[PDB]
Predict the structure.
Amino acid sequence: GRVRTKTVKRASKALIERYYPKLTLDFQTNKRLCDEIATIQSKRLRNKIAGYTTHLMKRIQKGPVRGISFKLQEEERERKDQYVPEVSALDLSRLNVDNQTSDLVKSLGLKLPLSVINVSA
Amino acid sequence: MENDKGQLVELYVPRKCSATNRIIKADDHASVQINVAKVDEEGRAIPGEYVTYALSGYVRSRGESDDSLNRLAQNDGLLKNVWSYSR
Amino acid sequence: GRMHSAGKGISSSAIPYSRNAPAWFKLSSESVIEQIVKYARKGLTPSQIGVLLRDAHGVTQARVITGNKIMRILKSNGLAPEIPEDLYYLIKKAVSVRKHLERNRKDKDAKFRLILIESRIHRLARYYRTVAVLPPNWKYESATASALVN
Amino acid sequence: PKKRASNGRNKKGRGHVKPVRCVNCSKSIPKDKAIKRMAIRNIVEAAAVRDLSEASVYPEYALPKTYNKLHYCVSCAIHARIVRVRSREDRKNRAPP
Amino acid sequence: MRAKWRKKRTRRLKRKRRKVRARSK
Amino acid sequence: VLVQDLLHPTAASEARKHKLKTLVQGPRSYFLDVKCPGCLNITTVFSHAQTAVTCESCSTILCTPTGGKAKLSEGTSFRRK
Amino acid sequence: TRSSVLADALNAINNAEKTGKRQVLIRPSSKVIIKFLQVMQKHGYIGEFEYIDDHRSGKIVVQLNGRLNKCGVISPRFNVKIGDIEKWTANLLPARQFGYVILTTSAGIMDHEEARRKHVSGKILGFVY
Amino acid sequence: GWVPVTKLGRLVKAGKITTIEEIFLHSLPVKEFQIIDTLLPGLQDEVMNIKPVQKQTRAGQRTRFKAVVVVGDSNGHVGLGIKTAKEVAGAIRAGIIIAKLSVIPIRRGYWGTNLGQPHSLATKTTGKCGSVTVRLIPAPRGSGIVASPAVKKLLQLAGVEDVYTQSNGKTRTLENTLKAAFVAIGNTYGFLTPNLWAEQPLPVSPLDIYSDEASA
Amino acid sequence: GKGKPRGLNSARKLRVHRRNNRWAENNYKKRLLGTAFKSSPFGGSSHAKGIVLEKLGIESKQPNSAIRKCVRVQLIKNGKKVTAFVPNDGCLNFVD
Amino acid sequence: SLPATFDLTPEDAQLLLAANTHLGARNVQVHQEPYVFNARPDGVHVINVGKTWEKLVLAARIIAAIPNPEDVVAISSRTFGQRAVLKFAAHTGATPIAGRFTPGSFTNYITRSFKEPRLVIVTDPRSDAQAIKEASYVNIPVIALTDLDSPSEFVDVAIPCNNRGKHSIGLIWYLLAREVLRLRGALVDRTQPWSIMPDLYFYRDP
RNA sequence: AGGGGAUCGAAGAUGAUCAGAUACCGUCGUAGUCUUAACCAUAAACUAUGCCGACUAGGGAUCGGGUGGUGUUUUUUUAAUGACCCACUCGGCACCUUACGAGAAAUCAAAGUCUUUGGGUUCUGGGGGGAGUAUGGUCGCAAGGCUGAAACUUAAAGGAAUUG
RNA sequence: GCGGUAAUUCCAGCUCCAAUAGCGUAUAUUAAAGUUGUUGCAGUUAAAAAGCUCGUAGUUGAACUUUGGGCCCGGUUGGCCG
């Protein structure tokens, strides 16, 4: 019930997405920057805006968010996505084959350096 | 109908399917027109020359459009071993 | 089909496309013809003669290794029974069921099956009289059936 | 109005099935249309389990239970909440929880 | 009303009419 | 499946299909040229013989018919025809 | 059990045409079936058909083009005069310039246009359009 | 301002797609009515029935007017639109937008001899909506349009002056009857003839080369 | 087979079936049974003649509340009694 | 009429065999697919790698024939394919959709997430059914990375592959990207294999 | 008209209820279930879906029968078999894809292949009542069954969803 | 369906319609009626599939028999022709 209205929710989302670099983590300067960047008709409403803004930034700092954050989120997504596991170890070095594994390539006519290794039962 | 003494008539001859040869209606919003390019000895999709296969909504909703496209491409030479006629 | 039932089962032989095959046996058609006449004199109905020949010797079909049919050659040679095999077996079934009804009149299922069997008997007799293999006025009777079955 | 595709029972190609009636009211229901349930019951319903364990001559037993076949009426099953009144869309749920 | 009891009532009426007609002729 | 070669089916497909359901119906049976040990008694037998046939020598039945194909004796030399 | 083999064959043709399939297998390939197929081929309505001659009755395998909307059989074969064929062609075909209702007459098997031109009538079998 | 947001709309802005026949050939789904009214300005809009419909709510009935209206140009193209609105004017406007979006071409043929301009339908056609089915068959030249008044008016807007109609079912349901007529018109365009058996191939359309100059 | 026979020699059966099923229509049944000629009190005539007997003040059926004030007429050709409505406003004193 | 340079090569064959895409669905299969040949006991359903590559090159040809990569759009909802569609969007235009596909995208010209794509690529129809029905509504072609047990309904080009394997799905997505880039002009060295490898198509848990 | 008539159980003998219980719910109990001479022929006798034929939507474990498998374990392992699995079936009982098919809709592998209307046949219906009521005719010992109206009356009766 | 004290419906005064010396009413019959259905109706729930089966009349009832080719000409065609 302490959760606020969807109108003020959208106001906070739009403010964050439009002036993310301007605002900072500190809550007091968050209020004193929101009051001058956004026209709000209620001091209580602007207080709730800034409170949810600092709450969402705290969640961002400790917790991942999908798309409602800044483009620096996309930047860090592309930096962490292209992060190789140290070296290309285990890559194809294990090629071992079997009966069916031979059979397919022999049927398709594309010979491969296969080695027949089935279960020794 | 077709008149000998000119008189260009029957405006907007409908576009006709290539899978089951049936007709494609005026507002059948499922009919697709696959536009696949031609490669000419250079590994390049040279612009301005493609071949078209029209697939109708009936074939789409039946779900054999895949096999129909394979057989059409193989008959046209676009594909080699997708579909064997002797099923 | 299944005239007197509700089943729709299909269980029939599949004669091959062969017309005169394999034509490998050195014993001519005289040998198979004597085989059938000897067995008919021995006293088997043509269905039994045919199945016994087929499973004993190598015969594609009596039709294709002779010039005529089994019943055709039996009729020409005079070994044909007084009544056809189908009617004979139908009458045998009818007399067996009739004796069962006499022993246990309370068997309504057997009474129903009896009516069903006599229906087939009468229809087949009508067909035979129409095609003139059997003489006219020949009728099936519960009395004369006991004489005809033996 | 055909409210049920199976006609509210389990009988296709069977003609007639001898019924066994309900134990609470015995209202007219054939055995296939019945709500026969495999009722499973513990001896103490996990209430005097410590007393059972302490007073058993041989401790740490498997402690089996009672299985019975309750033949339940449709009206009585609804009244005692054996069966739930479900919506038209999910009335076709064959697999029970 | 119930058609079963309508049928019962009409059967009783038919029986009464039959008895009356039998006694009258 | 909209376009299919009904002219010529594959051998595996025809074998999978029922014998009466093929393009031209053909029997699923064959001839078993069979022989008992000792004397030759060379006689070809139907696969679905339906009879307990035996050679004229003595009690040497070569078939014990079942619902479908007929069981053979212990030692029988048989060849497909 | 099997009253009109031509009707069964034409129903199979209609089912294949509505499904979109490009080929049909037809049992048991009567000669009137073959003549109907020949007329369809002459008018360019069915495509191709091949007669597999198994010894029992024969089978017809048909390579279809989607040019065919639906064919039908008119049972029984009504005994029709010239005005009667006029009525039938006014009743069974979408228009006057296209569509061919077919009838057996003394001059072989032909559609209504050819029957009119030869000035002879017969018994109506079916229609193609 | 107009500024439609759709590839069709932007192509019409550019003027690359210049023909209603061209849009109907590729059956590209239409999303606006300004495109239609600019492409075929010779259209006439007439309504026949606006009907009140009542939703009984825990206190009273909420009445919304359902409007069915057919609009098109007097040569070859008409469409129908159904919509329920609070006001008569709003219902008419919603019917107009829906019908202009649902405009369809008509295959007009000759009863025979192909002498002059088309006067009837090409092939006998059926259209079934709910229970009422309406079939149109080609009349000979001069007879007129034989139909119930609503279908008759639809045919006058259609422009074919000679047709016979046979109706079965509850034709007094005007909405279903008009929709059945619409499906019948669609089917009589969708029928097949040797004139359509004629040379089809129709190679690559300029759609790919005219798809490059769109905003997005 | 759509029920009804579809043979070239079934004209007799179709005619008989139509003849038997025609009796389900009220108009054909009444016309061929002559009920209007005998059972109807006008004798199968458009108009009849009679003698007024008395006045009837039968009431209307719901939802309505009025008196129609018809008359009782004994016909001349057959003598049957009927109740005849007096239509207009104040024709009772004329048809007393 | 092809110059016969697009045929299967030992390197790609070994890559496919290593990622085990030759194993498709379980013994249950869809009757519309002749891709499976001689599938052996134990459920092994062997997929035809040659047919897979032919479908792959056909799909590459279609998306190279489409002139506008911005108009080309890919759909994916499974976690095993979201990374793949983002890699595709990095490699070329192929404007993708991540996570759930919001209904009313290709239709509903007034919504903010409205796309109009000239063609749709889907990874798993069983999870991305909404996309194929919207494509059927807005009459656009669609390639589907179908399995041997997939609803091929409303699908133009069916890729014979496996949807239970992350390695297989990433490998086929990479070959899609590589083939389209090669046919477009990004990779002109036909003899030399490409810069990366499909080990990009993955996901580190930490 | 006989045999069991033990027990329950149309009819019939009690109370919180009553302005009324001769109704539900206590107990008891006649007629009443297997069977000689047999009748009766009705049921929501229902799949409210005639029968015989031909082609068609993820489709499996299946019920009876047949075929093939380094096929699985054993009996008497390596010399039959039975049971199981994996495939192909032929025949019979059931269903959820927003079905392209049909239907007014529930819904339907048939209720599809029917306005693009015709595979062969049998039976039944023509608004609701009166009324399954007949003066009649047949069967039955009876109860009753089959056949079966009309006069007159009525603007509705009804089916399938959808809003509380 | 209207009329129970603002009745556009009853009675009456101005206007309009079928028609013009012709219109209104009653009873039949035809189209309407694909509610008699051969064309061409319905039978799961709107009325309707006999409780089930057998069977005479009646209706209907695999396929095949000269399917096939060459030349000439009494006769047509807005005719590759004014």
The CA atoms of residues 102 and 114 of chain A lie 7 Å apart. The longest strand of chain A covers residues 96-97. Chains A and G do not touch (no CB pair under 8 Å). The two ends of chain A are 66 Å apart (CA to CA).
